[PDB]
């Protein structure tokens, strides 16, 4: 037989290793001719695999390096102007690897070039809080100040421009050991720890969804017409870099001004963690200078895009999409996940060539430029856009599989909730002390719902991942899953080696998933997904499940503005028609349902199938959300405080958070109440794409 | 049988006269009793003739009113202040009619109120080029005059908008005999012609495809939440009033400074036609005063919607929808149209309950307050966005059926020129001469293709009517088919009577067709193309006609563009990615209509149905024109200077017209660019829908 047990079956741990060594022994860093290189032998083994048709897909994008002969650094300077400290040119590489050339050293991709000198402010996390409680409470003002702030949290870039808008003329990054050192483990190469030489790569846009900065809305083609860099979206306006803990030590420790305003401002290093400005009385005429000289540049880039064409609705599209550019060697982030993605497409293929085929089709993507704003996937999905909204049923991702060893992780749209519990009931725990038991079982027991008591935890999709085109822009159905830690000891950051030099195939193979068993599940997950997806004869939404969340969602948004009565007194604010239009979906999906179980017709089934499929489709607005035109979703948008972060209700969330300093209530009051209308009609208007149609 | 042939053989000439004089005995003005009256009529009788269902959708909109206690009228007045002349307050009634109550009298809808006094500019038709001859050539500056023009050649809104931007006070709107009298023929009630107290009624908003001008993007609802008036959409900031000839007499004889420019500023009155500014020396201290007092007002308006099932497709919808408000009796505009509608219901009727089904579903509608911007129709689609554009076929639009008894008028999209090329030769021609020959042989006669010996003319949509929101904003298949004249006396303007009182039941029977067969050729036309989109197997669209107007429209712009061939080297302007992409669409859609032509299966049938459907979609850009958001539109919008008339690639028209005035011109042919990008990348993306699918 042909089924999901035989797809499931042929997957292998033994492949899996083999593709990760194979993808991890060289640099693969955007726009570079070994990721070109790597782009064309997966191009090859796709076919060889079987798929249909294998094509590159190539974008002409703004990227963002180093200048190899005039080096990125830090400094603190005397009265002279003499510079006494200078912060690293490099990490030291790795054991085995200290021979690799063109390793990027560490850098903030697309900072502007610039030399800056000033008194140092350290800014905590660099949140909108953070920077509230400075300016407000501790009456400390960071303008003309160079700020340090250690990562977590949020993404980098949101502290970049929270930084930018309090005034400040540069921004140093570095990671404390308090969020990126596990009590009780060793530094790499003998844990999975950050050593003090260790530094976080990434880039610091605040893109809100446009893609390649030059050409915001279209494809950056062979003609396409290109902003000036002026015009640009997203880019910083002030310089930043990003250092390690004992860099950071030297920066940190002559520090003066205010004490930190409580023990959650202290990291770990013996270091008072004064928030200053500027250095205590014996130093007090020292400074610190920046030397940055990073370039912008038009780059080439290469998707590459496989084919699997459907048997019976060729003209449905499930997609399975994951990057494959790398900072270094990738062997977490990303090629732990492209190396599942390869063994994926090695089963669809070899159930192809004994003569199957899925109902529906499946396309397969190794993104690139992920790591400098999600360009591959943005600029194809431009591209593509009418074909994705009419034909698009799915979106999978696929980046890193593991972050942990501990238990699964799920985000994904409510429509994909059942389907990930009747898969994850009919799979294998490979977790120790669950031998034979259901990974459901596993994962409900380790990671339990905050809500129903016997379910797992799923959570929002947030952003700063390739699904963003996808699900907030385009409205396609998504979802992602990998093993993850248990969020003990370091509970508000990834791994300790994230974006370093150390993410290694060693890291992989000998501290985090030494049988390959981990990433055996999650291929297990993804591609199971996959299968269902696109050979189920009615696709495996339930609107119900959307119903049960908009309700939570609603019970939330309301309980904020609640905090306000005199206002919501004052101004007429009411929920009452959001509650309406929720109550109204949880009734029209319930009817649907009963539909969906009672009808041999081909029609009344495709019809069907068609409102499931047009359902993620039903909650965009074609104006965007206020200032931020690419995200189009009215339920889910990444926080504006957090990109990696969702928020439910987004555009009323806005509307409300800190509504108490604004000047002109009546104005900000009557933007929420526009925002609870815009929020409600929709609603109302997606549960009434499941009435019957005629 | 069941067939087109029966259906249009139930059709009856007397049946529409019946309709027609029971539609036009008492006013039906948006938002009044006798409008929800004659709507409570139409849903009782669709639903007796036997539609599935029939409801009322109602908005709450912005409407316009004069003050019944308090009139508009404009003076002539003295030194002294001293009002030495008056305009009429209301229009002579016609005879027999001189008792009914509740006819508004003569106002241009959305008017502000005020009462300045100024000197007079006479402005010719106050078109864009007219007001470059003024300031450019003539050096006449409008700034605190009050403008008067000629209606004729472009939408009055248009005509308004650029009198504000040349500086005015005020506008007086007039019917000259030179463009609303017919030589030879009578004045109403002994002919067709406009008398000297006849007056013309208007709204002048600027909307740009808004709809309600305080809800753009949503429909105006229960809970909608509304702009205040200070940010509403599209109202004029100036004072506005039209007046019959007799009374423009009075006001343009005393007129002196400049002498009109030429021959082409002279209407037929018997006045020089000078330009002013102001009177001649005995009269050059009197002056013009207006006195507006409409005020603004939401108020309730109420569509009718029928809907007939389909047997086979009923998740896929054929509209045919006409408005039923009128200014006055609305004998022409809209009963003539709506008349024509009613019978068409009648006859699917007839089939239905003989057992008939269509085969996809069609939707009947009766569109209120047309007349005071498309608000009924506009609301209706917003509030219905989602299921239109995943199900919306094509969309078929029923306003006036006669403009005149001379031969046969279609605008519509190339994907239903060969629909109607098929219809028109199995119709038969009701024109004298033509007795025996099919309607295409009269029509082609009459009206020959400026391009194709052996074929008839059939134009572009423009606007200025409801099919707007469907075409232009979701991007919906549409046309429009009417009688109309022999464009050789008045070549520049609608019907002489256009939305004056004497518009009525007689009107139409004794002088534009006494035997209502033009009107039952209309239906014939309207409703025949109805059954075909509705009840076809493959959707009767040719994506070829689109390929060779394309190739066309690209000829047109590049032509204007060469005019500045300087410019052209200088700043690199091609449209070779343009003419590449219309080369791409000619090639495909010719590949597309070799497989539609071979294949017993529903399934590829659906997917090469909904290519079809979804072809006019792939036009849509989410991203609108510039600063008309609701023009997605990017081969045809309205015309920036005349709602009436279409414009071809609007997008880089616009960006070259006046060119060689622009201050920055690296800046302007810049956009020029831009907009090429934008226009090759939406063709090469529509041609690529039409591609296999996988
Ligand atoms: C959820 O689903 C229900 C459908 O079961 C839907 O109910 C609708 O509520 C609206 C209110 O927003 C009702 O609208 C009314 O329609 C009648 C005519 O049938 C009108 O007469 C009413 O207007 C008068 O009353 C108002 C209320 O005080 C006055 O302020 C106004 O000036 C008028 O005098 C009113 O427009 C509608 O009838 C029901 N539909 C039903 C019961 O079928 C509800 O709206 C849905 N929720 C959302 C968010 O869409
Ligand atoms: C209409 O249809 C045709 C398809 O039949 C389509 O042709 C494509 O044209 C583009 C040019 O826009 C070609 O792109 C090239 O791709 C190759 C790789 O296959 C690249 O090496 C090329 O880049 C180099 O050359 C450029 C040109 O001078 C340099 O400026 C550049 O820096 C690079 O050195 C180039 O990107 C593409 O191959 C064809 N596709 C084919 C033939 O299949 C055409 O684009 C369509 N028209 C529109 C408007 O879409
Ligand atoms: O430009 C972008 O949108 C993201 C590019 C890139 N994307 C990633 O690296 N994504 C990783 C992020 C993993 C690390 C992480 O999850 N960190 C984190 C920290 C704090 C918090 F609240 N949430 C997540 C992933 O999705 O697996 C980046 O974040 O620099
Ligand atoms: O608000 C709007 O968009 C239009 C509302 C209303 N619509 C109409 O009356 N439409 C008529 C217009 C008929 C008269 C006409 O065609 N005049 C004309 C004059 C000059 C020119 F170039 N084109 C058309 C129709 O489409 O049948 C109006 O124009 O005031
Ligand atoms: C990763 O695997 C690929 C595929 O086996 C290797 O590329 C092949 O190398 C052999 C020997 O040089 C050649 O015969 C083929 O032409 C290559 N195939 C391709 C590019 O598809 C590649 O060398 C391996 N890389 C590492 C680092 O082990
Ligand atoms: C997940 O599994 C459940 C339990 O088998 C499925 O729900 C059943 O579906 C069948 C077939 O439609 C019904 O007749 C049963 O009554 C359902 N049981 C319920 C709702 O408790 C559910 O549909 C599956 N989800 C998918 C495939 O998305
Ligand atoms: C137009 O036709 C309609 C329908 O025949 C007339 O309305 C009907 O009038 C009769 C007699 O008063 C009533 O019995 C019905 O209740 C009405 N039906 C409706 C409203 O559906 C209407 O009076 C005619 N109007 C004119 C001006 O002749
Ligand atoms: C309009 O009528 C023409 C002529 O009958 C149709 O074109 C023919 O269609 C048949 C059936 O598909 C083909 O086998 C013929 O070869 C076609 N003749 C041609 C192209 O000259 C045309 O399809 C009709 N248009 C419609 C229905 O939209
Ligand atoms: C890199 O740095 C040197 C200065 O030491 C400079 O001359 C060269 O132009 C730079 N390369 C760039 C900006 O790409
Ligand atoms: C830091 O680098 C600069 C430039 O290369 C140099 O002048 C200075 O001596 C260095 N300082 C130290 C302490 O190494
Ligand atoms: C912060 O510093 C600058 C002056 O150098 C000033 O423009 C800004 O208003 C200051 N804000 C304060 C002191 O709160
Ligand atoms: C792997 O699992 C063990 C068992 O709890 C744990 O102690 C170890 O820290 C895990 N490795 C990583 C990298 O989390
Ligand atoms: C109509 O006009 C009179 C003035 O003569 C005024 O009192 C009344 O308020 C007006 N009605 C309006 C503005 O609706
Ligand atoms: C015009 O109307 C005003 C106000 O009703 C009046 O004072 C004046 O006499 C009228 N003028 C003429 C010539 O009728
Ligand atoms: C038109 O008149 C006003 C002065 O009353 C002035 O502001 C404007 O610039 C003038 N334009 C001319 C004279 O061209
Ligand atoms: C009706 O047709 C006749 C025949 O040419 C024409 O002379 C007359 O003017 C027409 N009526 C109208 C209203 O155009
Ligand atoms: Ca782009
Ligand atoms: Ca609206
Ligand atoms: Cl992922
Ligand atoms: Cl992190
Ligand atoms: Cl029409
Ligand atoms: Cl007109
Ligand atoms: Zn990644
Ligand atoms: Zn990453
Ligand atoms: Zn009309
Ligand atoms: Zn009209």
């Not at 996390?125 to 501790?138: N, V």
């Not at 929270?162 to 140093?172: M, P, R, S, T, Y």
């Not at 950056?220 to 250092?243: D, K, M, T």
């Not at 499930?318 to 900072?327: E, Y």
Request: neutral net charge; contains cysteine; charged residues 20%.
């Amino acid at each position: 037989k042909h089924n999901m047990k035989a797809f499931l079956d042929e997957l292998k741990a033994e492949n899996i290793k083999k593709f990760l060594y194979n993808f991890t022994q060289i640099p693969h860093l955007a726009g570079t001719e070994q990721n070109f290189q790597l782009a064309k032998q997966i191009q090859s083994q796709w076919k060889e695999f079987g798929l249909d048709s294998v094509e590159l897909a190539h974008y002409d994008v703004l990227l963002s390096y180093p200048n190899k002969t005039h080096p990125n650094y830090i400094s603190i300077i005397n009265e002279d102007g003499n510079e006494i400290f200078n912060t690293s040119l490099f990490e030291p590489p790795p054991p085995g690897y200290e021979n690799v050339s063109d390793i990027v050293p560490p850098f903030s991709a697309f900072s502007p070039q610039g030399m800056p000198e000033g008194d140092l402010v350290y800014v905590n996390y660099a949140r909108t809080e953070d920077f509230f409680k400075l300016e407000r409470d501790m009456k400390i003002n960071c303008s003309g100040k160079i700020v340090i702030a250690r990562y977590g949290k949020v993404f980098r870039g949101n502290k970049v421009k929270n930084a930018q808008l309090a005034g400040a003329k540069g921004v140093i990054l570095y990671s404390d050991p308090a969020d990126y050192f596990a009590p009780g483990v060793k530094s790499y190469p003998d844990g999975w720890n950050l050593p003090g030489g260790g530094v976080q790569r990434g880039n610091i846009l605040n893109l809100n969804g446009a893609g390649d900065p030059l050409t915001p809305g279209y494809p950056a083609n062979e003609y396409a017409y290109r902003r000036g860099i002026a015009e640009a979206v997203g880019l910083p306006s002030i310089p930043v870099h990003p250092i390690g803990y004992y860099d950071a030590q030297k920066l940190l420790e002559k520090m003066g001004g205010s004490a930190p305003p409580d023990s959650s401002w202290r990291g770990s290093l013996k270091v008072p963690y004064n928030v200053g400005p500027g250095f205590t009385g014996n130093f007090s005429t020292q400074k610190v200078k920046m030397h940055i000289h990073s370039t912008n540049e038009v780059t080439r880039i290469y998707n590459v895009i496989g084919t699997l064409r459907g048997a019976v609705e060729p003209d449905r599209y499930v997609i399975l999409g994951g990057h494959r550019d790398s900072w270094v060697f990738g062997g977490i982030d990303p090629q732990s996940g492209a190396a599942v993605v390869h063994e994926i497409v090695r089963s669809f293929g070899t159930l192809k060539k004994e003569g199957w085929r899925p109902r529906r089709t499946i396309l397969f993507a190794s993104w690139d430029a992920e790591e400098f704003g999600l360009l591959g996937s943005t600029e194809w999905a431009e591209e593509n856009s009418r074909l994705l909204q009419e034909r698009g049923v799915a979106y999978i991702n696929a980046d890193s599989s593991i972050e942990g060893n501990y238990t699964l992780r799920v985000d994904c749209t409510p429509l994909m909730y059942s389907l990930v519990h009747n898969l994850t009931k009919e799979l294998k725990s490979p977790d120790e002390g669950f031998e034979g038991k259901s990974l459901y079982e596993s994962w409900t027991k380790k990671s339990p719902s905050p809500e129903f008591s016997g379910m797992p935890r799923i959570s929002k999709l947030g952003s700063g991942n390739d699904f963003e085109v996808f699900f907030q822009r385009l409205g396609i159905a998504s979802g992602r899953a990998r093993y993850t830690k248990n969020w003990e000891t370091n509970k508000f950051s990834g791994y300790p080696l994230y974006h370093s030099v150390y993410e290694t195939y060693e890291l992989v193979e000998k501290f985090y998933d030494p049988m390959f068993k981990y990433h055996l599940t999650v291929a297990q997950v993804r591609g199971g997904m996959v299968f269902e997806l696109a050979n189920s004869i009615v696709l495996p939404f339930d609107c119900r499940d959307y119903a049960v969340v908009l309700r939570k969602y609603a019970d939330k948004i309301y309980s904020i503005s609640m905090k306000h009565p005199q206002e919501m007194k004052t101004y007429s604010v009411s929920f009452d028609s959001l509650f309406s239009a929720v109550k109204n979906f949880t009734e029209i999906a319930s009817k649907f349902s009963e539909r969906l179980q009672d009808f041999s017709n081909p029609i009344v089934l495709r019809m069907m199938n068609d409102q499931l499929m047009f359902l993620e489709r039903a909650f965009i607005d074609p104006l965007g959300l206020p200032d931020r035109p690419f995200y189009r979703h009215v339920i889910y948008a990444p926080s504006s405080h957090n990109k990696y972060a969702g928020e439910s209700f987004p555009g009323i969330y806005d509307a409300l958070f800190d509504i108490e300093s604004k000047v002109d209530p009546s104005k900000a009051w009557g933007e929420v109440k526009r925002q609870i209308y815009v929020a409600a009609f929709t609603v109302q208007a997606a549960a009434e794409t499941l009435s019957e149609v005629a």
